[PDB]
Design a protein around this ligand. Structure first.
Ligand code: FES
Length: 95
């Protein structure tokens, strides 16, 4: 499956089609979108986003606790989309 991911940043928004076995971050860059990143391994906060709608699989992540997750945070470097979704990006400091 290839899923629509809408990325909302401070000043505007962009939809991209992300295959379900590619990380949101990887696809974003592939599309010329510059997101923040650091470790790229699910172990810091630098790349975090916030799901507003849809679902992701970020099973490869280790930084977010069970309540950051439930509240919708996502480490975009390690998340695959599991449906069309919408994510507010540059959410690092909320952690
Ligand atoms: S860049 Fe460190 S968690 Fe994604």
């Amino acid at each position: 499956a290839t899923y629509k991911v809408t990325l909302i940043n401070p000043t505007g928004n962009k939809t991209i089609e992300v295959p379900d076995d590619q990380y949101i971050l990887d696809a974003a860059e592939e599309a010329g979108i510059d997101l923040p990143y650091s470790c790229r391994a699910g172990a810091c906060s630098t790349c975090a986003g916030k799901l507003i709608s849809g679902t992701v699989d970020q099973s490869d992540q280790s930084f977010l606790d069970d309540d950051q997750i439930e509240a919708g945070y996502v480490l975009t470097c390690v998340a695959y989309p599991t449906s069309d979704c919408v994510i507010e990006t540059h959410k690092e400091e909320e952690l």
